[PDB]
Design a protein around this ligand. Sequence first.
Ligand SMILES: *[C@@H]1O[C@H](CO)[C@@H](O[C@@H]2O[C@H](CO)[C@@H](O[C@H]3O[C@H](CO)[C@@H](O)[C@H](O)[C@@H]3O)[C@H](O)[C@H]2NC(C)=O)[C@H](O)[C@H]1NC(C)=O
Ligand SMILES: *[C@@H]1O[C@H](CO)[C@@H](O[C@@H]2O[C@H](CO)[C@@H](O)[C@H](O)[C@H]2NC(C)=O)[C@H](O)[C@H]1NC(C)=O
Ligand SMILES: *[C@@H]1O[C@H](CO)[C@@H](O[C@@H]2O[C@H](CO)[C@@H](O)[C@H](O)[C@H]2NC(C)=O)[C@H](O)[C@H]1NC(C)=O
Ligand SMILES: *[C@@H]1O[C@H](CO)[C@@H](O[C@@H]2O[C@H](CO)[C@@H](O)[C@H](O)[C@H]2NC(C)=O)[C@H](O)[C@H]1NC(C)=O
Ligand SMILES: *[C@@H]1O[C@H](CO)[C@@H](O)[C@H](O)[C@H]1NC(C)=O
Lengths: 49, 49, 263, 97
Amino acid sequence: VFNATRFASVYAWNRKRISNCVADYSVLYNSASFSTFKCYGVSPTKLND
Amino acid sequence: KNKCVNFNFNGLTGTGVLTESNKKFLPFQQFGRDIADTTDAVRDPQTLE
Amino acid sequence: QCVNLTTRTQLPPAYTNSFTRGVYYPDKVFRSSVLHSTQDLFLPFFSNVTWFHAIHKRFDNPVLPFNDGVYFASTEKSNIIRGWIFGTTLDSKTQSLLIVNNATNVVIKVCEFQFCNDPFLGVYYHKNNKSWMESEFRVYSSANNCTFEYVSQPFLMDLEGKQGNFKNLREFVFKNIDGYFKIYSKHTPINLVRDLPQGFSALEPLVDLPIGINITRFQTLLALSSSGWTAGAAAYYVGYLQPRTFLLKYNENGTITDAVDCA
Amino acid sequence: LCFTNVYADSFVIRGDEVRQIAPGQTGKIADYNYKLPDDFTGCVIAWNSNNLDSKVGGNYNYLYRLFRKSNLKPFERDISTEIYQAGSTPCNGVEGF
Ligand SMILES: *[C@@H]1O[C@H](CO)[C@@H](O[C@@H]2O[C@H](CO)[C@@H](O[C@H]3O[C@H](CO)[C@@H](O)[C@H](O)[C@@H]3O)[C@H](O)[C@H]2NC(C)=O)[C@H](O)[C@H]1NC(C)=O
Ligand SMILES: *[C@@H]1O[C@H](CO)[C@@H](O[C@@H]2O[C@H](CO)[C@@H](O)[C@H](O)[C@H]2NC(C)=O)[C@H](O)[C@H]1NC(C)=O
Ligand SMILES: *[C@@H]1O[C@H](CO)[C@@H](O[C@@H]2O[C@H](CO)[C@@H](O)[C@H](O)[C@H]2NC(C)=O)[C@H](O)[C@H]1NC(C)=O
Ligand SMILES: *[C@@H]1O[C@H](CO)[C@@H](O[C@@H]2O[C@H](CO)[C@@H](O)[C@H](O)[C@H]2NC(C)=O)[C@H](O)[C@H]1NC(C)=O
Ligand SMILES: *[C@@H]1O[C@H](CO)[C@@H](O)[C@H](O)[C@H]1NC(C)=O
């Protein structure tokens, strides 16, 4: 998701199904460096629980 | 004292008549609060009365 | 220094009753002639305050849990209880808080201490001088990474006395909430022999330390060739605070004069 | 307005991570080295310091914690440098797989 060599154009934006996986978002701390990360249906603290 | 004034003690803005009290605040206390929880007494911060 | 003083008799764990103690002023607001309900980490009424002795024979300084705050009290004579150690490893893998009252001044310091298995202070008793003076300080070996440090203005507090019944009760509440370590304390004279006096008196706040360390265990520091000594006639009691509603009576002068434990 | 007890917490972070300084946030700054309480009463102040702190060869005097067994508590400061175990094995000494 966050490392794909080539992203899609915004008019042709891609959609990928994520299923049967563990959402351990900690793994990308070392290398993500997100300028924006905003949640709208949850508090960000709760994502692990 | 004894006149109606718009007071401000440590930012504690309000309107009321100031009067000399006989309440004995232990030093760690600056404000006293009513049954209604409205601040009813204050320790003047320049002349500690 | 750092020495193990292993000469001591083995006794089982004692307990006693916290009748109506461990109540403190819940905030710095004044209130008089009112009954005030508040929910906070209080010492539950009539709970078991674990009980420890220093005798002659017995010198009890265990490392104890520190969870949801602690109530600490010491029926003290001849100034035997002198401080505490707080932390979660007490081995310099992590930081720890040291509070010590020594003969010259009170010192509060937070460092990566390397504490001894048996920390203590010591006094030379009647060594041809008529007065008593402190000589031994054996709690930690080195204190490198310090991030908080306070030392009070100097004094001389006497370390001599042999009267039978305890003449001082010192009470403390310790809470470590969101990086602020809060201490409430009270002092009352007593004339009791061997138990936590029955009665009621609320602790005023005195100091709030922004140490910001993780505290899971704590240990009190008592005054005391390397092995074989005599312990002072002093006893201290430890309870634990739980989140409980307390109704508090304020008298006409604003001091909490009575309280009721809602549970 | 007057203030009763005032503490200034001073530190340097990557510009992307200023958003993590708000109370109730996640990320390796909020999670592992600096957490603000949910009822935080105060103000957050930050300014771009590239002209002061940056070094042509790279200024490495500014450190952040990348691994932690658990998210730290508000206003908690973890100085520990002990090695973090990612796998199920224990790891002693200085380094390992
Ligand atoms: C504040 O310090 C606490 C004490 O060190 C610490 O709790 C400790 O957490 C670790 C890891 O969760 C525990 O280590 C053991 O955990 C279980 C048993 O509880 C075992 O399966 C593991 O293999 C490991 O041996 C400690 O037992 C635990 N200590 C206590 C007294 O509960 C807190 O996590 C610290 N707080 C923060 C925010 O870091
Ligand atoms: C605040 O300032 C006042 C002076 O501006 C201090 O009060 C003075 O105290 C002396 C000694 O009692 C009096 O002679 C002066 O008349 C007082 N000043 C006024 C304006 O009445 C006061 O001490 C200061 N606050 C504190 C906490 O020291
Ligand atoms: C006091 O006794 C404790 C044990 O009760 C000693 O701690 C041991 O120290 C050795 C290294 O010197 C370690 O290998 C052991 O694992 C430790 N045991 C425990 C239970 O911690 C301590 O060294 C002694 N101190 C003195 C000054 O004799
Ligand atoms: C915690 O203590 C260690 C050990 O002294 C400190 O590591 C030293 O840091 C200084 C300053 O950069 C170096 O000159 C030394 O070479 C380091 N010693 C070792 C053995 O690595 C560390 O900096 C301390 N941490 C804090 C936050 O004070
Ligand atoms: C007696 O006091 C003096 C200083 O007043 C001190 O130097 C000396 O060591 C003391 N003697 C003993 C036995 O402690």
